[PDB]
């Protein structure tokens, strides 16, 4: 039903810093979730993010101390600010919304890619 659409990918360099956005194009509860998931070349994808009520966050063990997810509840739109990004960090990332009545239905975006570089 509901689009999700990120925007902000690209390219950026190791230690850099990068901010993801996604927008719904309807009406998102503020106590579902809206969350990042992410999926790197020859791994399976993986949880990143997620809030809900506004400022109730959830990281993976691998970002927590550098990422930091933000959600706009009036806009529908949720944010993934990146900083002290590491080479292990390049995937595409996909915003994801969990909703709360059962927890049994998961909404996808179409993905945006991120690339670290190490090269300087
Ligand atoms: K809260
Ligand atoms: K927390
Ligand atoms: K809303
Ligand atoms: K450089």
């Known amino acids: 039903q509901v689009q999700l659409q990120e925007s902000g990918g690209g390219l950026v360099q190791a230690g850099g810093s990068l901010r993801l956005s996604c927008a719904a194009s309807?009406?998102?509860?503020?106590?579902?979730?809206m969350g990042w998931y992410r999926q790197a070349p020859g791994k399976e994808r993986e949880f990143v993010a997620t809030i809900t009520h506004g400022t109730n966050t959830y990281y993976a063990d691998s970002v927590k101390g550098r990422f930091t997810i933000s959600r706009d509840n009036a806009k529908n739109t949720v944010y993934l600010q990146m900083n002290s990004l590491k080479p292990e960090d390049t995937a595409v990332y996909y915003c994801?919304?969990?909703?709360?009545?059962?927890?049994?239905?998961?909404?996808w975006g179409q993905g945006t890619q991120v690339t670290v570089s190490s090269l300087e």
């Open positions: 309807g009406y998102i509860s503020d106590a579902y979730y």
């Open positions: 994801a919304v969990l909703e709360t009545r059962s927890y049994s239905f998961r909404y």
